[PDB]
Amino acid sequence: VVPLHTWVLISNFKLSYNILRRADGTFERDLGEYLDRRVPANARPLEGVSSFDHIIDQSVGLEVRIYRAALEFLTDAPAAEPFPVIIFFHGGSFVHSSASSTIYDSLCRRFVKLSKGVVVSVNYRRAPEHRYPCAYDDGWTALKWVMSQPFMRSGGDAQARVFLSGDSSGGNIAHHVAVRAADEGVKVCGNILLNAMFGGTERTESERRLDGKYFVTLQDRDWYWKAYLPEDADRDHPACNPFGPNGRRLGGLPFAKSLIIVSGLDLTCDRQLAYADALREDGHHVKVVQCENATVGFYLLPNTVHYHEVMEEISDFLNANLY
Numbered sequence: 001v002v003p004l005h006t007w008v009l010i011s012n013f014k015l016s017y018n019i020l021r022r023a024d025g026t027f028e029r030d031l032g033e034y035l036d037r038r039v040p041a042n043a044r045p046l047e048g049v050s051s052f053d054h055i056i057d058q059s060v061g062l063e064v065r066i067y068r069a070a071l072e073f074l075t076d077a078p079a080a081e082p083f084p085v086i087i088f089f090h091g092g093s094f095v096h097s098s099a100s101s102t103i104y105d106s107l108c109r110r111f112v113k114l115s116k117g118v119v120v121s122v123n124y125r126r127a128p129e130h131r132y133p134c135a136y137d138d139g140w141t142a143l144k145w146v147m148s149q150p151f152m153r154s155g156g157d158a159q160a161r162v163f164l165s166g167d168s169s170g171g172n173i174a175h176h177v178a179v180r181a182a183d184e185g186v187k188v189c190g191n192i193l194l195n196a197m198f199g200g201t202e203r204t205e206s207e208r209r210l211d212g213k214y215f216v217t218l219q220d221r222d223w224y225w226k227a228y229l230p231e232d233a234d235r236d237h238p239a240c241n242p243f244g245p246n247g248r249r250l251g252g253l254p255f256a257k258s259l260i261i262v263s264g265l266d267l268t269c270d271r272q273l274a275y276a277d278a279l280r281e282d283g284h285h286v287k288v289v290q291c292e293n294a295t296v297g298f299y300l301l302p303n304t305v306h307y308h309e310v311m312e313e314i315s316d317f318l319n320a321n322l323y
């Protein structure tokens with residue numbers, strides 16, 4: 001059973017998003033922006049956390065929201081003691097939501113309380129207007145920006161202790177940014193993936209079994225992939241299916257340790273677990289948290305055991321991977 005408040009909240013998204021996707025693959029963008037629930041940044045702490053909006057790349061208008069316990073502070077000296085910086089990529093299937101979306105503002109606030117660190121939430125460019133690889137470009141831009149701020153740095157070796165994190169499409173983005181980091185010898189302390197979004201041309205058992213049962217449909221999954229991938233591409237494109245027929249194994253790369261959180265009632269759970277399996281197979285460290293009773297979005301409402309469990313696993317993983 002889905003708790004009633006989760007059911008109501010996620011259904012509200014499901015039904016609204018139904019009217020925004022057009023049959024021709026275009027999107028009701030102005031209406032989507034108008035209907036999204038969002039909050040401003042606020043320098044004044046709410047429950048001990050403050051937030052600040054900042055453009056980090058003027059060429060593409062790329063903005064982030066920075067959260068910390070409580071503008072000029074970015075200049076501040078590297079902290080004596082280590083702290084995590086979590087670079088967060090919101091969900092919404094490459095198409096929806098924003099760093100200002102209340103569900104994500106609230107999650108980032110909770111991440112700061114939980115990590116005693118800093119959260120940088122990236123307003124990546126969205127599909128269908130901006131297709132592959134724009135969102136990945138923006139996450140790489142954000143990683144490099146974070147690494148270069150004195151404030152973000154900490155510990156003996158005064159460096160940014162960066163974790164890449166995201167749910168849904170943002171978890172996909174986190175992965176691809178992490179791969180690029182490993183290719184370029186940029187150190188990432190860990191990836192935190194919540195229901196990371198992956199796909200492929202064939203359906204898995206979970207996809208066929210859970211289709212339409214828990215807010216998500218294959219029609220809509222196919223729609224979002226079509227919206228993000230190049231016009232001539234299919235779901236076996238490596239952005240979508242990083243270890244499928246057109247994929248690339250990651251053996252030998254200095255790849256991040258991964259905490260991989262999977263909802264058992266997310267119809268794509270099979271792919272997330274096979275993703276984890278492939279990382280392990282490539283010699284990388286993976287911790288998988290399977291939340292068998294959880295639907296998509298469970299980490300958004302503090303109303304299930306899985307919610308509490310996962311916040312604790314996140315805290316443990318951060319602590320374990322900081323020093």
Ligand SMILES: C=C1C[C@]23C[C@H]1CC[C@H]2[C@@]12CC[C@H](O)[C@@](C)(C(=O)O1)[C@H]2[C@@H]3C(=O)O
Nearest residue numbers: 013014017091092093168215216220296297
């Ligand atoms: C069309 C969509 C997009 C969904 C799934 C389906 C219905 C509910 C949506 C959200 C809406 C709330 C969260 O952003 C989200 C991450 C979540 O938990 O549910 C979204 C999810 C996704 O982008 O993967």
